[PDB]
Symmetry: D3
Subunit: 339 residues, 6 copies
Amino acid sequence: MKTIKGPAIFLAQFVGDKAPFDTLDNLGQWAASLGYKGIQVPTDPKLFDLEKAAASKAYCDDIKGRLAETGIEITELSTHIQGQLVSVHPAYDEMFDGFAPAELRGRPQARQEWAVNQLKCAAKASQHLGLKSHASFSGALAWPFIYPWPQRPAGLVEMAFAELGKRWTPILDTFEENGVDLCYELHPGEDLHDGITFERFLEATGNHSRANILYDPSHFVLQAMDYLDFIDIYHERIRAFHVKDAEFNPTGRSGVYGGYQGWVDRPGRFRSLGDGHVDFGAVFSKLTQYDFEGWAVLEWECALKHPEDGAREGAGFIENHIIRVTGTDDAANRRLLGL
Amino acid sequence: MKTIKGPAIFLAQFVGDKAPFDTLDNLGQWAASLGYKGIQVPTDPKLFDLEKAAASKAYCDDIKGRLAETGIEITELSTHIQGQLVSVHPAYDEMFDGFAPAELRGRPQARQEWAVNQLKCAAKASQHLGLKSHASFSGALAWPFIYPWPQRPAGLVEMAFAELGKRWTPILDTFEENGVDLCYELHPGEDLHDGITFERFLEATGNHSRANILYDPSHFVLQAMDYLDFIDIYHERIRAFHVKDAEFNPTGRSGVYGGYQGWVDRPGRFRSLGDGHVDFGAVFSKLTQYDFEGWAVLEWECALKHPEDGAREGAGFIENHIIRVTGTDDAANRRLLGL
Amino acid sequence: MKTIKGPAIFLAQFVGDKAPFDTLDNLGQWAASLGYKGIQVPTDPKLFDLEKAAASKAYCDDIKGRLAETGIEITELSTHIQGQLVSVHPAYDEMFDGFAPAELRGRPQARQEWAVNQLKCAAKASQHLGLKSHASFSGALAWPFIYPWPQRPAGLVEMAFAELGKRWTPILDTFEENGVDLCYELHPGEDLHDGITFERFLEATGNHSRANILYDPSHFVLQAMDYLDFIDIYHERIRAFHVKDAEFNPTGRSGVYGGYQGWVDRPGRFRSLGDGHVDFGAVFSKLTQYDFEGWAVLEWECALKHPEDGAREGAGFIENHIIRVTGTDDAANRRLLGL
Amino acid sequence: MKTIKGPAIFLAQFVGDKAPFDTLDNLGQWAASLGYKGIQVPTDPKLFDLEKAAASKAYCDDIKGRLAETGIEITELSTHIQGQLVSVHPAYDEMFDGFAPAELRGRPQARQEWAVNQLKCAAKASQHLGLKSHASFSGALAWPFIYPWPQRPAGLVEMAFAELGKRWTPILDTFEENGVDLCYELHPGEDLHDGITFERFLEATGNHSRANILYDPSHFVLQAMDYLDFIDIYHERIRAFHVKDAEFNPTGRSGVYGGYQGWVDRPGRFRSLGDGHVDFGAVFSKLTQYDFEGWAVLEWECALKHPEDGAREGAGFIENHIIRVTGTDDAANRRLLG
Amino acid sequence: MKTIKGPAIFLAQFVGDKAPFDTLDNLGQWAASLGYKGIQVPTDPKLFDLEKAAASKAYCDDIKGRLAETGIEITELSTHIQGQLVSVHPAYDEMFDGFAPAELRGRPQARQEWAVNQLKCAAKASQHLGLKSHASFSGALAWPFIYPWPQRPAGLVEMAFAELGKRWTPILDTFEENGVDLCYELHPGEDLHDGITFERFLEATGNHSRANILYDPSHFVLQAMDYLDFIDIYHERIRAFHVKDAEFNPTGRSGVYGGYQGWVDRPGRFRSLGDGHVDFGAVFSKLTQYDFEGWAVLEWECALKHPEDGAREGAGFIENHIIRVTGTDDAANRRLLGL
Amino acid sequence: MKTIKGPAIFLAQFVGDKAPFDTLDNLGQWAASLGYKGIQVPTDPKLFDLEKAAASKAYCDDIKGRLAETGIEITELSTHIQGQLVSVHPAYDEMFDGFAPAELRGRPQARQEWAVNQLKCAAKASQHLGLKSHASFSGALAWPFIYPWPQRPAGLVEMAFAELGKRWTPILDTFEENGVDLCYELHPGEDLHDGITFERFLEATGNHSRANILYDPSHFVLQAMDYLDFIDIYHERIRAFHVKDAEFNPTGRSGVYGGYQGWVDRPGRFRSLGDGHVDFGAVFSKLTQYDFEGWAVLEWECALKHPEDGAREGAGFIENHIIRVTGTDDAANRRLLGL
Ligand SMILES: [Mn+2]
Ligand SMILES: [Mn+2]
Ligand SMILES: [Mn+2]
Ligand SMILES: [Mn+2]
Ligand SMILES: [Mn+2]
Ligand SMILES: [Mn+2]
């Protein structure tokens, strides 16, 4: 078996405009000062330009070396934002424009083609940095029709997954030639939001060997789904791990849908590590038992706790849950049995 | 203090092409042969024309007299379809067009105005028939944004409920003029899908006394919501009752969202009476103790059982769960409490 | 979907020396009077001669015709006894001698070969009777070593299952020629006692298409195993069904092993239908949904109830749980998905 | 009430060939460096010679005195291996030979007699060392017939327990002479594997006052038995305590029997302290309230964790769960009851 | 084992002043018309005079013969009312005065001495009727001090139980002479309200062989006590059985104490058979397995249902839960064990 | 939202005769040495004289001054003893006399009015010390009648609650004039023992704005009541917080009532922090979310643990559970909703 690497931290929730949350160098020193050994880097042109990194290996060698001076390593790159723009339903076109470059706002086809190019540059930059996995979202074409009311016409869902496979298969081929695994995070508001849809997406891509899963148990808790049985079924396809807590406390007034309430008042909400319902002892045990060769990446989000306390407690929490791992005599065996 | 009336049956799920599921005349005879004493009638021009009924009391008196000869009475009228069209998000324009008259398809503003007029004529026809309650849907403007991804802009939800109240307050005033309660069914794909949103809608209408609830526990089971505490909280506003069973069996592959699966394979699905998880013994007990003065109406749906068997077993099921209900001395009281 | 056939009854627990429990005809009239429409017949020479049935088509046609006069048909044949003798560990040699003919006692190799011939004759007799399935046990070579104390030497388990496949593959080849499925009952005291061991046996037979499962949930309840999840995993290999109830009530004095206690005092014990813990509503629902084309066969056993009352109630219990089963406008679909 | 003594550790799972896991002296210093105050010693002739210890008081005082210099005390002696060999069914004769001295392998009668003598020497050696309890197994004659299929002939189970009591009664009488309690660990693969069988064995020995229980909740979890109710029923016969964690997670493929799977894949498996299902807070509370005068001895076993990490964490775990313990006016009572 | 006799019915909750609820003769016919075969008779002078029954066997012979002509038998006599008055705390003196004859109201010691004499006459009258058990209450001296606030002085509890033994031992000696078991019903408002207090009472009476228990699971449910484990511990002292249902649904507003609420609103309340939480299948199985030689007597009480429907349904409920019950070869055994 | 202040400690369980448990100065040094930042002081004459404090602000300023030199502040005052004596049923007259000054023993009416004076003087002293909250008990008139056996006569409960308000309303008006909240601790042996009784008392005082709740989850656990839903309902009236653990383990011998057993053997008993069943993570989260501006005060009690070890561990336990807290584009919103 294998000892899970960590602790690491996802910087997306901590970027800002002042120090030390403004540059990658400063975020690396901040993370290393708290006890983390790795970082998951979002590909924002301010922090990490994918186009320069995909063009010159030298650009990547500078980033890698300068982070290693502080004691930090890049675990994976993140294209959650760009992956979302690969497939967008028109009802959400304007809500997502704030995630695209300003010059592309109001131009949906140009925004989609820019996102596909970003994903392909992410494969090449990952090879330069020596990374084995990459984190992303899948986008959503059919999410407005998640509940069968009004009744979904015949062929609607099948067309959505055929189109989704047609758009991601070229990108998946690019990750093959660079030897990088593509890990989708199953998340509400995506067509890939549970295990059934991931199996359906696989068949639409010809069972591509680079289509894998980023495991985050919090989203399964928020929809009352067994996150531990998920590991038992899909362990062969799990290549990345988000450590994130959540709780679901249904009342007589609201359930999973949430009633348009804010995060503080929803029955299902995210919590700081240790303050939710996730059995992280069981999660780390199963990942250790199924030979998971990856990083335990903290993705922090809480409805109550101050952000600087959550980032500090996460490092100790992860390090306490990581587990350090440790002839045939036919004739005799024949005698022991009836043979 | 009140014995729940019943058993009754909602005819929406049983209309067909040939006898006895084609006319209101035959459906009443069919319901009476199975043991039912009342019917909930959908307002489809083939079965019940609201315009003719709101204009001529004789039309209403004629239908009532014919049904009473077989031994059946109208419990309530249904405008689920028309109530839905009062508020439609553009993403669903074509999916709902099959529910409007053919000449209104493709004309969103004309369809919405036809729906408001249908609702007002139903309030007058309900007085003509001597009915106390009326069942309907609320429509949905914000359902595509039920999950906060992408993040909801400030004021989006509050504008949706302000608009929803603006459209229903004129209709609610018409129901007040006729002395009829309007009962919304909390349902996925509606802005009113749990108790929290109903409370928000009530405030947006100024606590209008005609805004009430049609209680159907099956939809609460499908979103992992406590359907028994719901009765304890909102019993003062519950004026109608749907008897409908359902089950929720989460797996390691899917949860409440369902993964675009059909009804047979979804973790949460409807089942025939007695084959689900709803504790109907407790449901009838709570309604009986809170003095529910209405009808127990069967709304049948199952992924497995044949509809002829479901309708037959329903009548006996409801009858077994209905419950038949049954100065001051001071001087002594002062001695017992030692003054 | 398919409607489960039944109710049927397994005669093994009711055969005796006095009427109406002495002959196959008397048992057939007794079963038909109680409401059963099928019977599972153990292959006891007193009841059914495998050697005569495998040799003459007339013998089988004779039995079938007489049973059809009473209204009963043979569901499957049973070789639980003979199947057990295909693999016996020396520690149990004498305890099993009462199940073989008297002349074969004391001779383990001749007894084992007599059992192989019995299994092969059952495949021929099943074709003559027009049967599609056959029920049996697997035998046990490694059951004394079910708990790893003393520690099992390397290769012991792999050799036991290699021998089982070596002995059953010739028999399974005979069942392929006659077109009959062989259904093993997962049972304690057999090497095939749960789902993991069945998968191991399958690979030892070259993934043979005739190796299938007889599903009996009671044995899973007695060892605290999720009998409903078993159906979701193995439904493609389930071809027979035993309806049998059981309960498991652990105390501070005893658990699954039972402490050599009798059936009345064991924490886990069999109970008459309806008096145990098995959720038969869920069992029949899952079997109906996965297109099970078999019989619901009652195998009765209880620690308290009189056997005559148990036989009388089984037919009604099983009958209440059986469930009677019931273009694409691309252009529109592309507009709905904004393509 | 009594404060449970500890933390202590059972050395059986840690003996090896490299230092400090080779000799009793090295194991005692290793345990003391990790924070333990006691050790449970397996009586293997290469680790602790029972025949020499039953003959010479000086030998025991040497071992005891040397260990006290390190800061360690012997909690009890262990004859799990030898106790198993007092009663062995022929189906397991060869599988158990690896636990007997080389000269006894293949000679079932000589092996059983050597084991009976080992148990009797353990009583004297415990008296010399000033120990009150002794840990052992009972052996098994009827374990292959634990499930009634094929059906057990009449008198089979009764004969097995009659022979078991007949073999242990002489040994138990020797433990009475030395004033030492004999604590059986209820364990699968023994005839004594739960509370019902222990009560049956107690009667077959004439309710012998020296037959007691070593409480280990992990074995009860793996067979889905209520380990907390066990303490409420048998607390008066509980004289030793193993702290050991375990979990039972049934699936749709396997249950308690386990399907011949290894420990990593079994539904019910042992886990390091704190990583299982045992409510140790409740266990220590019940033992404290029932006046348990013993040691909390760690018996470590895990399917995943490295043995060096498990031994290091156990001492702190045990320390956090130990609980430190702290004329009637008749006329007035008559007035209150009027 | 023994088959539990029944169904029987306790007449205390149904006696009134109008026919057929006024005389024992009319009540016996009413019970027989509903399907009951036995009755538990309260010892109220209007229905059954103890002074006349304890003095003349002929009076007892008259009632037995008159009841046997309708098809009904007396199961046991009840002195619940009188047994309470054997021990009363002064705070409740006036509240219980309504159950004694008017001439004793005011004199506590005369009322208590009247109750002791009533109990002794019930012992002789039960022997005359051929009854082997007798139902009663124990009274309470320390019930106002059930919660240790204010703290209890030393010796208070021990004195109360010393007084109970002092008062009941003479009565228990009288039941020994007549050969009748005295069955206390563990009930709130009594000193004997659970198993711990019954054992303490047994200690204060010298382990008197006539002190036994009337088992009623509803009172254990109302205080969140394991009623099934109770049978396993005390089955050797259980001689009578009340079939009575109850439920306990704690909220965020109230618990076991109940907040002085009425029976309709209490979290713990009594319910008609089948409408509560009691697992009667488990209760009847355990009583059958421990050889209970008594009657299943219905004691009816519900917060909602009409008393006539409950009495009609009780007989069928009891009928479906009653369970109808059904050398050594040393040498061979020595070979199987290996000597 | 606001961060809960703490850790603090209630000194009532720790006062003694020798140092440091004899004087308030010594108790403050002992409490501060263990890590506590606040203290709850019982109003015992030997420690804090209400008369001198209600008359002289300087006396109060001394206690504030000298305690601040140690690092400790007075959180609130406690008049649990005096509050109990405001309403006493005669059955407890002698048991409670030990809490009044020696001259008041046997003087009931003087004991009651002495307590009213203590309560009113406590408001002044709280006004002087700058405190916002005050802890007390309510007393009990009807606690002997908590179970309706014997049946409660009409008007008994209503008169008891009418008298409670008549006695407390003058005291509550005094707390109004000083600006201090009066927090009742819902406790067994009081008329205010759950949420339902608190609502009844509130209605009897004219919804007095100064009548509030001291939240202690241990007492709800001991009567099997949902302590987390209590917070959701009454959070507006919760002004004080006791950190106290407890467990409830029902057996087959005893339940909630306890059978007059001692604390070590009762099914429901108090335990040291962390050794009970209270989910304190959820409690602190709910109090943080509902804007609780108060103190987390440890009230220690355990059946097993030594009092020193409990006081030392309590401070660290509370610290780990305290949570440190942190235009509208109508046109865009109108486009997202379609209209
Ligand atoms: Mn994530
Ligand atoms: Mn409905
Ligand atoms: Mn079977
Ligand atoms: Mn152990
Ligand atoms: Mn009763
Ligand atoms: Mn408190």
